[PDB]
Amino acid sequence: ISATVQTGFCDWSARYFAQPVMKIPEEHDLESQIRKEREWRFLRNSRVRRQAQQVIQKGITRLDDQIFLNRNPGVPSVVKFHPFTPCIAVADKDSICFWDWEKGEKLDYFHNGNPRYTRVTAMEYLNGQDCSLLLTATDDGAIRVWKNFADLEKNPEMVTAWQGLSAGMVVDWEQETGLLMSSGDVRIVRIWDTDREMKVQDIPTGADSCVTSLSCDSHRSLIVAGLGDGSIRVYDRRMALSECRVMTYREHTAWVVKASLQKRPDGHIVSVSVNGDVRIFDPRMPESVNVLQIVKGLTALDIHPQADLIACGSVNQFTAIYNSSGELINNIKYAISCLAFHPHWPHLAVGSNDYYISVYSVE
Amino acid sequence: EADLTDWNLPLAFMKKRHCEKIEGSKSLAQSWRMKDRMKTVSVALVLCLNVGVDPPDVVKTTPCARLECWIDPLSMGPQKALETIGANLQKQYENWQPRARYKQSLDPTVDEVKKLCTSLRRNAKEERVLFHYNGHGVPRPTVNGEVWVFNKNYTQYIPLSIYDLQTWMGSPSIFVYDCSNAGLIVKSFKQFALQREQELEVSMKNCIQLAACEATELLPMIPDLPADLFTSCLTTPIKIALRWFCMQKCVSLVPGVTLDLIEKIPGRLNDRRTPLGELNWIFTAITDTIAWNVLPRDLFQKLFRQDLLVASLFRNFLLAERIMRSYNCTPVSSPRLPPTYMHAMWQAWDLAVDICLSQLPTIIEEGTAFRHSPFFAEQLTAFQVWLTMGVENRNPPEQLPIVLQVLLSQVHRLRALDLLGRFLDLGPWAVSLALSVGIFPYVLKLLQSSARELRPLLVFIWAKILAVDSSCQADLVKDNGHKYFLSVLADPYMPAEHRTMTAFILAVIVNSYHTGQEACLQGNLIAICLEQLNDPHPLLRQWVAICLGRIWQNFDSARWCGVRDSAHEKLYSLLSDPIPEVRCAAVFALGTFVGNSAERTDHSTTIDHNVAMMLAQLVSDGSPMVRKELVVALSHLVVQYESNFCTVALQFI
Amino acid sequence: VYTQIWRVLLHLAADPYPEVSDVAMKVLNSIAYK
């Protein structure tokens, strides 16, 4: 009988009545230090958005500057840049290295907790504007969120974690909508609402091959999803689940490395398969507008929404960073399996098969 | 700018359930409960008045002081006066303790005192007995610890040893000495107490002692004051308080207030709406307030909360200290009190007196209706002002015991109950304080009221209290207070905020308490809960479901009632609720429902399998908090079917 | 029915969240030794 455990849930609930009620909450207090620090962060954001916008207006020059060169213990699988704070999380199969590009130091080192077979495929920055979090979706399905990841007085803190689904796993965060769309080898695109902690919509993929990539559009339902067979479906979640699919154009036959969508209202699906040929699609058209072929054997690629730089990779150490029109800018000579631009600054991370991370900059 | 987009963004996974740990707050050691209730069973009035005779030790002045218990002994003749004073003294004491065996002794012998004390001790061996001694007619007590009485013929002052006097009286007793060198008795009492303690190796804290004077001091001879100055203070506080008020210099501020108007004050000591009852009510509040602010918490509950009669004596003792101080007299108590005579609240007492008997010329002569004093109103105003900037844990507000006294009437009950709730809001430390001052038995009496306006205030107050001390669920079942709240939970017009607290209150009363589950089952809780199960408030849905789960915890009778009402079916709707608090609470209730099958009829087994599959459709859930209860819920299912799950577990090996 | 409830407990035993996996493992081991 001693095995009978009782949760503290009912007791934790009762704590609601210990705290005060009648008085104004701490957030509504206009003179509170948290609101001023939150407004100070948003003040820093508006400057960083403006300063980055000024760099865009000056054009994009050739990018060859090396800010730093560090070495990781493990292979860099996925990299993301925090929009405003300079924190460059470079996760590994069995860890999450947190590096920096101003001091040039390792800030933290997690353990994901997943077995040896599994692999950290995707990563996001939740609530990037303030009090940012780090979503860490594992390939098997496990999604988990980490707080206080590069802090001085604080430690790793996993907020919540739940087996999604059940290529690996793909995610597309939607800050404003509050939803989260896991996808991968399954033939379903779930939409996990994080406010209701329930799967709202399960969009059927309608495709045998694995969903290699998945990107959506803010302020609209434009779920783009590349596939391993080559096709790139698009689904609108506003209509019925059977009717969710709108267009199904197929002009490739390989795994889609990165079917990326642009944040402009003029959306352009820049899809690059293992073949390495770019085909810029539109949501309102059935076929590609432009076509390009860059490298024969592509290994990894990156793009930037604000600046249309298609940062390619190469088996022969090359790093071709061309425009969407197809103009030559740089060919950086070093398996470069991870490149990553900033959402605002023209910084570009690079990562070869050797566990070495670079961060370039346009002067 | 691009900042309005930032401010208007949901911060996902940033709420109480995420930041704070899912852990219960540790309940503090609630010591507010009274250890025991004493009962003063009988009273001994030993009167050594010696009416018509003057003690040789003190050469009384020609006017001297004649009044004894507000009775002139020489007016009535010697023998009758002595009987009358004993009768009046009994009546006077009956104001404070009307249900006690009184036994007067009027100029007694030594045997008479022995037989009197031993008889009253026999009646209440384990209970407190009051010994009242008035030695105004006998010589002063000696240094050797002796007290004077008479002989059978009333021709010789016989000495009585304090040791022998405390031999005959038992352990629970209280001693009142009204004589000149009364300090000597208290010193010698502690000596004989220590002497008994030395003999005990090979009854001190129990014995209370009050003394009119210090051993060096002498009693006042002032014709204005009564000779029985100390006893009058203890037994008629208001009477001497007004007479003393009319003797101070502050009377110049109120011309036309003589003693004759004090004699003819209208009202009684019970009716608080009268002028005389007003003063008694005010006096009770001020004295109980001074005591609570000055004395240490332990000694306060010892004297002012244990038993009523002691509390009344010490309340009036504080007034004696003030009056007698003004005549080079220092009262003495056995539990030594720090000097309260110079406390600020005494000034408030003056103002209360001033306002109360400024109307007396118009009440007596003009016949004007006595308007009540603003005192209690202004004190509630003071308590409100403190709450405004009371967030910090500074010194507590002095007026807390006044709020208690205000709750007794109805005139200011609404305002006091409101402020008291606002006070409880400050934090759990304050609710602990309110329990130590002794608010519980008065809030419980209001549950007998039917005034529906009171219902929202009591629901609030009771939620805060029961959040701290959950043991009070026992008391609420005895007094049938759970019916008062059941009514509130079946009132659509009651706001959903107060209905949420009411569902919580019920979920606490029911918590792990078979007596309360059997009582609420008969009160038809499950049916009432289902009536509110589809409310537009996610907090209510959560607690109503937890409350539902607790009531059928190891109680099959409430489960059958749930089966008849078909609750498990109505609960499946909550399994798809957006709010994960409700989802978790829903999983809790369905688990406890399964857990108490106790090998019932086949019906139960088919229901348990239906409840399993309905829960088995909450696996793909985002919150692990909900998924945790899902395990605990399936624990209840495994325990019931341990023989069946062993078959499945052994299969896949 | 018991087959269904045991399959559920397998998912909670392999939970991403540590606290849920731990408590589920205890409850799953408390079956084995009976």
Side-chain angles (χ1 to χ4, degrees):
Chain A
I1 302 161
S2 296
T4 310
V5 189
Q6 290 85 352
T7 321
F9 159 71
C10 309
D11 300 25
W12 171 82
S13 300
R15 202 198 293 180
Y16 179 75
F17 302 95
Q19 296 176 353
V21 178
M22 293 181 182
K23 300 184 162 209
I24 298 163
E26 295 172 29
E27 297 180 5
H28 295 281
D29 186 1
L30 303 177
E31 293 161 297
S32 59
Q33 197 72 7
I34 297 164
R35 182 167 163 81
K36 286 183 192 178
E37 289 174 16
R38 198 188 175 185
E39 192 172 19
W40 182 85
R41 263 188 252 93
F42 293 151
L43 190 69
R44 179 203 63 175
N45 291 3
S46 50
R47 259 183 289 165
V48 170
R49 294 202 199 83
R50 184 190 295 161
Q51 292 280 12
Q53 189 185 340
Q54 284 179 25
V55 175
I56 299 159
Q57 288 173 25
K58 299 169 186 177
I60 303 295
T61 332
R62 289 191 171 182
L63 156 121
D64 268 44
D65 295 7
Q66 298 198 342
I67 296 169
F68 80 97
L69 291 181
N70 289 329
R71 184 194 157 284
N72 275 17
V75 177
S77 61
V78 55
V79 181
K80 284 295 186 187
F81 289 173
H82 184 282
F84 306 110
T85 313
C87 273
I88 56 140
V90 178
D92 301 322
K93 294 185 85 284
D94 282 343
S95 65
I96 311 172
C97 290
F98 296 87
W99 291 94
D100 208 315
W101 54 282
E102 203 166 307
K103 295 186 185 77
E105 288 186 317
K106 179 183 277 281
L107 305 172
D108 258 291
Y109 185 92
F110 293 176
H111 194 278
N112 186 251
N114 64 329
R116 300 186 185 185
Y117 297 99
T118 52
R119 154 187 63 172
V120 178
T121 316
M123 274 182 67
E124 301 296 342
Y125 271 99
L126 315 185
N127 305 349
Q129 61 270 14
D130 70 310
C131 294
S132 60
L133 304 171
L134 190 85
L135 190 131
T136 308
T138 319
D139 75 316
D140 70 310
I143 296 165
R144 56 193 103 196
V145 174
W146 300 92
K147 192 176 183 189
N148 303 331
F149 60 82
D151 211 317
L152 302 172
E153 304 187 340
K154 303 182 186 185
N155 267 38
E157 189 190 53
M158 181 154 41
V159 182
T160 169
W162 37 273
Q163 190 73 2
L165 304 181
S166 302
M169 247 210 67
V170 193
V171 193
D172 192 84
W173 177 239
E174 295 190 314
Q175 185 61 31
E176 69 185 64
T177 329
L179 305 172
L180 185 107
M181 20 228 93
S182 55
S183 189
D185 297 359
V186 295
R187 303 177 161 187
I188 292 165
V189 177
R190 292 223 218 288
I191 299 171
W192 299 93
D193 198 332
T194 62
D195 301 352
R196 300 165 69 265
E197 300 195 281
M198 283 182 79
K199 66 202 178 173
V200 173
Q201 270 178 333
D202 288 8
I203 296 163
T205 302
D208 297 358
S209 57
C210 310
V211 179
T212 58
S213 53
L214 195 144
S215 180
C216 312
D217 189 26
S218 60
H219 297 277
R220 235 297 188 94
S221 311
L222 278 172
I223 301 109
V224 186
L227 284 153
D229 71 319
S231 58
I232 302 95
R233 265 84 168 174
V234 186
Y235 313 99
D236 180 30
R237 66 170 176 276
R238 294 171 168 181
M239 29 201 58
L241 295 181
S242 60
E243 312 164 355
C244 272
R245 204 170 323 170
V246 177
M247 284 272 91
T248 307
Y249 31 77
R250 324 165 183 173
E251 301 177 10
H252 288 121
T253 310
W255 269 237
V256 177
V257 180
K258 191 183 178 61
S260 195
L261 186 67
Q262 293 171 19
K263 304 296 185 183
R264 303 197 187 97
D266 298 329
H268 293 282
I269 302 162
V270 185
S271 56
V272 204
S273 53
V274 176
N275 309 138
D277 57 332
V278 173
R279 283 184 167 281
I280 298 162
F281 306 122
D282 287 346
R284 310 187 190 184
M285 290 285 289
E287 296 188 325
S288 62
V289 185
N290 292 318
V291 186
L292 293 171
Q293 292 180 26
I294 290 170
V295 169
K296 189 183 285 186
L298 197 142
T299 182
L301 186 137
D302 198 58
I303 334 182
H304 180 212
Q306 294 184 352
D308 296 355
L309 301 175
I310 340 184
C312 306
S314 183
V315 173
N316 300 15
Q317 308 187 345
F318 300 115
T319 309
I321 304 160
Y322 303 159
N323 297 131
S324 55
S325 56
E327 296 186 314
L328 309 174
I329 294 171
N330 281 114
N331 290 308
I332 303 161
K333 301 196 187 191
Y334 199 87
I336 304 158
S337 306
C338 51
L339 289 85
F341 276 106
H342 218 89
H344 303 76
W345 293 101
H347 297 300
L348 171 63
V350 188
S352 59
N353 194 18
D354 201 358
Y355 346 97
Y356 277 83
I357 321 170
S358 79
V359 173
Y360 303 152
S361 58
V362 192
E363 283 181 29
Chain B
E1 294 185 353
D3 291 313
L4 297 169
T5 311
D6 291 312
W7 296 110
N8 301 323
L9 280 168
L11 305 180
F13 306 122
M14 284 200 76
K15 270 181 283 187
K16 286 285 188 187
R17 75 179 82 92
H18 303 294
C19 292
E20 301 189 334
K21 182 168 168 178
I22 305 100
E23 187 176 15
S25 57
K26 287 191 177 177
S27 57
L28 301 170
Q30 298 299 124
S31 62
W32 64 275
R33 299 278 192 180
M34 299 300 304
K35 182 175 298 299
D36 192 28
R37 166 82 219 267
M38 191 58 65
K39 174 185 172 56
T40 308
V41 176
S42 63
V43 177
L45 305 184
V46 174
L47 266 45
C48 297
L49 244 296
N50 210 8
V51 175
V53 191
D54 291 355
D57 286 15
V58 180
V59 184
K60 295 185 178 174
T61 322
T62 305
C64 72
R66 40 201 67 257
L67 279 317
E68 184 80 9
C69 295
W70 303 108
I71 299 177
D72 192 342
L74 276 53
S75 63
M76 311 183 76
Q79 177 49 41
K80 192 192 172 189
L82 180 61
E83 296 168 46
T84 314
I85 295 159
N88 275 43
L89 183 59
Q90 191 179 292
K91 290 169 188 167
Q92 288 176 325
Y93 270 106
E94 285 171 356
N95 290 25
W96 306 108
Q97 181 56 266
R99 47 167 85 270
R101 270 174 196 75
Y102 292 85
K103 281 203 168 61
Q104 298 165 23
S105 316
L106 300 162
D107 298 0
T109 0
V110 177
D111 300 33
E112 187 166 319
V113 168
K114 179 189 253 181
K115 288 150 193 182
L116 182 265
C117 288
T118 50
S119 66
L120 295 174
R121 183 47 55 188
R122 281 182 286 266
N123 299 345
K125 302 160 299 180
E126 302 178 357
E127 291 297 324
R128 193 154 302 269
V129 173
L130 175 57
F131 184 82
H132 181 94
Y133 172 72
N134 192 297
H136 288 123
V138 300
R140 294 176 284 93
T142 66
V143 175
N144 313 314
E146 303 172 307
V147 136
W148 301 87
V149 304
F150 307 87
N151 61 343
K152 214 204 306 188
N153 320 294
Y154 310 99
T155 58
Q156 283 185 350
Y157 298 112
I158 305 302
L160 171 80
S161 180
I162 305 303
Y163 186 86
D164 292 321
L165 187 273
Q166 77 175 238
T167 312
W168 303 328
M169 294 284 303
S171 14
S173 53
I174 163 160
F175 296 83
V176 181
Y177 317 114
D178 191 5
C179 59
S180 224
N181 296 346
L184 286 174
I185 301 159
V186 185
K187 283 186 78 176
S188 70
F189 194 97
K190 281 192 285 179
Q191 278 198 328
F192 292 132
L194 294 165
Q195 190 193 291
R196 281 169 180 283
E197 291 293 338
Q198 295 174 316
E199 295 166 301
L200 201 73
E201 276 93 49
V202 184
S203 62
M204 165 48 179
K205 292 187 95 293
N206 304 337
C207 294
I208 289 155
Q209 315 181 62
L210 307 177
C213 281
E214 186 60 42
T216 320
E217 295 175 336
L218 287 163
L219 287 165
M221 287 296 301
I222 303 153
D224 301 285
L225 302 162
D228 215 12
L229 191 58
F230 187 61
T231 296
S232 184
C233 288
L234 300 194
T235 214
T236 64
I238 273 58
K239 197 156 188 196
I240 36 86
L242 303 187
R243 187 180 297 273
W244 185 67
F245 179 87
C246 300
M247 289 172 64
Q248 303 306 263
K249 183 62 173 162
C250 327
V251 184
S252 59
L253 286 186
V254 260
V257 177
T258 52
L259 301 181
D260 289 41
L261 276 160
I262 306 308
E263 269 69 296
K264 307 186 273 84
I265 186 163
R268 306 163 45 76
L269 295 162
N270 313 130
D271 301 13
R272 293 188 275 219
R273 296 180 290 193
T274 63
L276 188 68
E278 253 275 44
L279 288 164
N280 186 43
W281 188 22
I282 288 171
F283 182 79
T284 305
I286 279 164
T287 51
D288 213 54
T289 297
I290 287 162
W292 190 74
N293 290 306
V294 176
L295 308 182
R297 195 178 69 77
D298 302 49
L299 195 262
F300 178 81
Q301 273 139 49
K302 183 175 261 74
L303 301 183
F304 291 80
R305 291 285 177 265
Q306 262 193 334
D307 83 68
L308 304 208
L309 184 58
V310 168
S312 300
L313 287 177
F314 278 97
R315 266 190 272 104
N316 302 5
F317 179 82
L318 298 185
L319 179 68
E321 193 219 315
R322 176 151 187 258
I323 287 175
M324 295 192 74
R325 164 165 187 284
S326 77
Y327 304 113
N328 285 325
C329 272
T330 311
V332 174
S333 57
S334 200
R336 187 186 192 186
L337 309 180
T340 67
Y341 68 85
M342 74 311 251
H343 197 262
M345 212 59 58
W346 282 121
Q347 275 69 18
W349 167 248
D350 303 341
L351 182 59
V353 172
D354 202 309
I355 288 157
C356 172
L357 57 80
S358 59
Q359 301 166 41
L360 252 54
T362 43
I363 293 159
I364 277 71
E365 305 158 38
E366 307 299 309
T368 310
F370 167 75
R371 59 169 57 261
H372 296 89
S373 314
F375 180 76
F376 287 113
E378 291 181 348
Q379 294 295 339
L380 288 182
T381 308
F383 185 64
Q384 190 185 63
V385 168
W386 189 89
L387 292 164
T388 62
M389 298 185 58
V391 222
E392 325 97 16
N393 296 32
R394 50 182 183 178
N395 293 353
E398 283 90 329
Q399 296 85 19
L400 254 183
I402 291 160
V403 165
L404 196 165
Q405 289 294 313
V406 165
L407 297 168
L408 306 183
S409 67
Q410 292 184 49
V411 298
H412 295 125
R413 181 185 293 170
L414 285 178
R415 189 182 177 200
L417 276 190
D418 166 64
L419 293 167
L420 180 65
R422 206 184 301 175
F423 179 71
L424 294 202
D425 192 50
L426 295 177
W429 102 77
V431 171
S432 195
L433 274 178
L435 290 167
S436 73
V437 75
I439 228 86
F440 189 84
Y442 302 106
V443 159
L444 168 61
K445 188 166 278 282
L446 294 161
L447 301 177
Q448 297 176 342
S449 189
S450 278
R452 291 183 68 265
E453 54 267 33
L454 302 185
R455 298 201 315 163
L457 301 162
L458 282 188
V459 163
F460 189 89
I461 274 142
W462 273 105
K464 294 287 166 189
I465 288 157
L466 291 167
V468 173
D469 193 38
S470 59
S471 72
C472 315
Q473 66 185 299
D475 293 301
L476 290 163
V477 181
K478 288 166 188 171
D479 301 49
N480 289 23
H482 76 286
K483 294 178 176 184
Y484 190 86
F485 298 120
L486 281 164
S487 88
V488 176
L489 189 60
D491 202 326
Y493 298 130
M494 175 72 65
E497 295 158 32
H498 293 78
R499 280 190 288 114
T500 302
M501 278 176 276
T502 313
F504 169 71
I505 286 157
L506 289 152
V508 173
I509 290 164
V510 146
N511 196 350
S512 68
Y513 178 52
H514 278 264
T515 332
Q517 292 179 11
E518 288 162 40
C520 291
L521 183 272
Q522 291 166 38
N524 196 30
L525 188 77
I526 293 159
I528 291 166
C529 281
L530 295 169
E531 292 159 18
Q532 308 221 321
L533 195 68
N534 310 334
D535 196 72
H537 202 250
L539 245 169
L540 184 75
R541 289 199 307 284
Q542 197 203 11
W543 274 106
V544 164
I546 288 155
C547 191
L548 263 165
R550 285 185 175 165
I551 190 157
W552 57 55
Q553 190 161 40
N554 309 289
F555 186 43
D556 296 30
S557 303
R559 172 159 169 172
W560 297 330
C561 179
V563 172
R564 295 184 210 106
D565 288 41
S566 202
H568 66 289
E569 297 297 320
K570 291 171 192 177
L571 227 37
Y572 300 149
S573 64
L574 298 189
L575 300 191
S576 59
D577 190 290
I579 290 83
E581 277 87 346
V582 174
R583 263 179 294 151
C584 185
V587 167
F588 170 61
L590 284 161
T592 328
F593 184 91
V594 164
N596 61 316
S597 191
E599 302 175 0
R600 281 322 168 182
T601 63
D602 296 352
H603 306 280
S604 67
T605 318
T606 309
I607 294 163
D608 282 344
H609 297 326
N610 280 277
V611 175
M613 292 158 61
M614 283 294 103
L615 290 171
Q617 300 176 45
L618 281 165
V619 186
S620 51
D621 187 282
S623 197
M625 180 186 177
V626 168
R627 280 177 294 159
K628 195 183 286 186
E629 256 297 339
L630 190 268
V631 166
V632 163
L634 270 46
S635 89
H636 297 130
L637 216 148
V638 168
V639 169
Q640 285 293 317
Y641 302 122
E642 275 192 337
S643 62
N644 300 125
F645 282 103
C646 283
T647 317
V648 179
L650 291 165
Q651 271 179 3
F652 302 127
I653 304 161
Chain C
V1 184
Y2 310 115
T3 321
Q4 193 168 325
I5 306 151
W6 198 74
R7 187 172 290 96
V8 164
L9 292 171
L10 286 170
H11 280 277
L12 282 315
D15 197 292
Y17 203 78
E19 293 167 27
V20 177
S21 54
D22 289 346
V23 176
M25 206 69 72
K26 285 188 178 177
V27 174
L28 194 65
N29 276 315
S30 63
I31 303 160
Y33 307 116
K34 289 177 187 161

